[PDB]
C-alpha cells in the first residue's frame, strides 16, 4: 500500500547527466521527508541525498554540486538529478520515504533503478535457445548485451519453479547470461516453451521459442 | 562521517539456531538529551531492496517477527535472532542516523549450511542458430545442491561461469557454464564432456555427448 517506483535509470557516458524519477502512491505525500540510497557493484550501500518535509536538502559529500534532490508534492514524485557522473557512481538507485512524519529514516523503498557509467555503446542482445526418461531441461542464452540489465521470463512469465536464472557476466562490454528450466519429459515439446527477454533503452523486446534441433545436414 | 563496522564477514548457521550480529560504530549514536540511540538494522533478500528490520537500535518495525530483537546502545549494538529460519537467508546491515552522512556497515552474509545435496547436471550443445551468426557455446547446469564448494570440468582456453546465491527455499546453489568457442574449431573435435566433483562425489558425476554432426 506504500509503493515507490523508480524511473529513467540506465546508461550514461562519464560527465553525462541523468534525471531519476521516483513515483509514489498510497500515502499523504507531503507529510513525510524522503531520500535516495545507492548500492555499489561491490554490493555496498551508500546514502546519497535527503529532502526534508520542507525542502531542506542534504547530500553526501562525494556528490555535492553534481547531484540535486528535488520533490514535487503536487504529483507525488521525487527526483534525483545526476550531472557529471563519475565512474564511481555506477550503481543501483533506490528512493526512500520517511519512516514516519519525522526524519529521513529509510522506512520504505522503491525497487531500484540502475545507473551504469561506461563510455560503451548501447547494444541489443542476441538470444540463443538451449534445446537438448524422467525429466528434461532446456535453457536460454543471451550472448552480448550492453548496458546491463535484462529481463528473462519463461512463457511470458507463466513458468514459476524450475527456473535458475543466473547473474549476468560482463566480458568485453557484452553481458552473457543463461537460464535453466526443468519439466517432466511429458511436458516438452508437448507444450510450447518460449524464452522472453527484454532489454530496455535499446527498446528491444525479444521472444525466442524453444524448438527441437532436427536432423538436417544436406 | 561516522564509520560503521559489522563482523564477522561471512558466517554459517542452520535452521533453529541463534544468531548474533555486531555493529561497531565510530561514535556514540546515543544522545544525552532524549536518551535515544539513533541506529537501525536492515535485511536485504538478494535481488530486492532492503527492508527496515530494527530502528532506535531496539524497536521492531511493524510486521517484523518476534524472532528478531534489537539490543545494545551507544557504540556497540546487537541484532538478535531467536530461531533462524531459511526465510532469513540474506545479508544484514546496520545504519546510524545521528548526523550526516548517513552510514552503513560492511554487511554480513549468513550462508546457510543444511545438508550435502546431489548436483543435477544438464549439458547443452550450441543452438542451430548461434552457429549461424558466428560462434558457439556449450552449457551445463548444476542445480539444487549444497555445498557451494564444488568446482567442475581437455583444453580450457576461455570459459565463463555464474553462481546463484543460495535459494531461500531449499538452501541450494546452482551453476552456469559458458563454454564459449569458435564455430569451426567446434568441429575440429567430436567428443564433448562436462564433469563435477562434489563433497559427496568422490567418483564424479558426468554428462556427455558427441558432436551431432559426427
Q: Does A5 touch chain B (CB under 8 A)?
A: no
- The answer for A 102-141 residues in CB contact with B (under 8 A) is 103-112, 126, 128-132, 137-139, 141
Distances (CA, A) of A138 to B81, B135, B208: 40, 20, 16
Gap between the Cα atoms of B135 and B95, Å rounded:
48
Burial label, A24 (beta-carbon count in 10 A; 0-12, 13-18, 19+) = buried
A144 contacts in chain B (CB < 8 Å): none
Residues forming a β-bridge with A47: A37
Q: Does A64 touch chain B (CB under 8 A)?
A: no
- Residue B75 phi/psi, 5-degree rounding, is -135, -15
Technique used to solve these coordinates: X-ray
Q: How many residues does chain A have?
A: 218
CA distance B137 to chain A (A): 9
Which residue is associated with the grid cell 523508480?
Answer: A6
Distances (CA, A) of A29 to A1, A24, A74, A75, A100: 13, 8, 9, 9, 11
Closest CB to A178 among B91, B128, B176: B176
Q: Does A98 touch chain B (CB under 8 A)?
A: no
**Which domain does B17 fall in, by range?**
1-113
- The answer for A 9-38 residues in CB contact with B (under 8 A) is 35
A180 contacts in chain B (CB < 8 Å): 122, 141, 143, 174, 176
Q: Does B104 touch chain A (CB under 8 A)?
A: yes
Which residue stretches of chain B are H helix?
130-133
**Which domain does A12 fall in, by range?**
1-119
Gap between the Cα atoms of B172 and B119, Å rounded:
9
Return contacts of A129-132, CB within 8 angstroms, 24+ apart. A129/A195, A129/A208, A129/A209, A129/A210, A129/A211, A129/B127, A129/B129, A130/A178, A130/A210, A130/B124, A130/B127, A130/B139, A131/A210, A131/A211, A131/A212, A131/A213, A131/B124, A131/B127, A132/A213, A132/B122, A132/B124
Gap between the Cα atoms of B178 and B160, Å rounded:
5
**Closest C-alpha to B46, from B173, B194, B199, B208:** B173
Which residue stretches of B24-167 are H helix?
130-133
Amino acid at each position: 500500500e506504500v509503493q515507490l517506483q523508480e524511473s529513467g535509470g540506465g546508461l550514461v557516458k562519464p560527465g553525462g547527466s541523468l534525471k531519476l524519477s521516483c513515483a509514489a502512491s498510497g500515502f499523504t505525500f507531503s507529510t513525510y521527508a524522503m531520500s535516495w540510497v545507492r548500492q555499489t557493484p561491490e554490493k555496498r550501500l551508500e546514502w546519497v541525498a535527503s529532502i526534508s518535509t520542507g525542502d531542506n536538502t542534504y547530500y553526501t559529500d562525494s556528490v555535492r554540486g553534481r547531484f540535486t534532490i528535488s520533490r514535487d508534492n503536487a504529483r507525488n514524485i521525487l527526483y534525483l538529478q545526476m550531472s557529471s557522473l563519475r565512474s564511481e557512481d555506477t550503481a543501483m538507485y533506490f528512493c526512500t520515504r520517511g519512516r514516519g512524519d519525522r526524519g529521513d529514516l529509510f522506512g520504505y523503498w522503491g525497487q531500484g533503478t540502475l545507473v551504469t557509467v561506461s563510455s560503451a555503446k548501447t547494444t541489443a542482445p542476441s538470444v540463443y535457445p538451449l534445446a537438448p526418461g524422467s525429466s528434461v531441461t532446456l535453457g536460454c542464452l543471451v550472448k552480448g548485451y550492453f548496458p546491463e540489465p535484462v529481463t528473462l521470463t519463461w512463457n511470458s512469465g507463466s513458468l514459476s519453479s524450475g527456473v535458475h536464472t543466473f547473474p549476468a557476466v560482463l566480458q568485453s562490454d557484452l553481458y552473457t547470461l543463461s537460464s535453466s528450466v526443468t519439466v517432466t519429459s511429458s511436458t516438452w515439446p508437448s507444450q510450447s516453451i518460449t524464452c522472453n527477454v527484454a532489454h530496455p533503452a535499446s527498446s528491444t523486446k525479444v521472444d525466442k521459442k524453444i524448438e527441437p534441433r532436427g536432423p538436417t545436414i544436406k | 562521517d561516522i564509520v560503521m563496522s559489522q563482523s564477522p564477514s561471512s558466517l554459517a548457521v542452520s535452521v533453529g539456531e541463534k544468531v548474533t550480529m555486531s555493529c561497531k560504530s565510530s561514535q556514540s549514536l546515543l544522545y544525552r538529551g532524549n536518551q535515544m540511540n539513533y541506529l537501525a538494522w536492515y535485511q536485504q533478500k538478494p535481488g530486492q531492496s532492503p527492508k527496515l528490520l530494527i530502528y532506535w537500535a531496539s524497536t521492531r518495525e511493524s510486521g517484523v517477527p518476534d524472532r528478531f530483537t534489537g539490543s545494545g546502545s551507544g557504540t556497540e549494538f546487537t541484532l538478535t535472532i531467536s530461531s533462524v529460519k531459511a526465510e532469513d537467508l540474506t545479508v544484514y546491515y546496520c545504519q546510524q542516523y545521528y548526523t550526516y552522512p548517513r552510514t552503513f556497515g560492511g554487511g554480513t552474509k549468513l550462508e546457510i549450511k543444511r545438508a550435502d545435496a546431489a548436483p543435477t547436471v544438464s549439458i547443452f550443445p550450441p543452438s542451430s542458430e548461434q552457429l549461424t551468426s558466428g560462434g558457439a557455446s556449450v552449457v551445463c547446469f548444476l542445480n539444487n545442491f549444497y555445498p557451494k564448494d564444488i568446482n567442475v570440468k581437455e583444453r580450457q582456453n576461455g570459459v565463463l561461469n555464474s553462481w546463484t546465491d543460495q535459494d531461500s527455499k531449499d538452501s541450494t546453489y546452482s551453476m552456469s557454464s559458458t563454454l564459449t568457442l569458435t564455430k569451426d574449431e567446434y568441429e575440429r573435435h567430436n567428443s564433448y564432456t562436462c564433469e563435477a566433483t562434489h563433497k559427496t562425489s568422490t567418483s564424479p558425476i558426468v554428462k556427455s555427448f558427441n558432436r551431432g554432426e559426427c
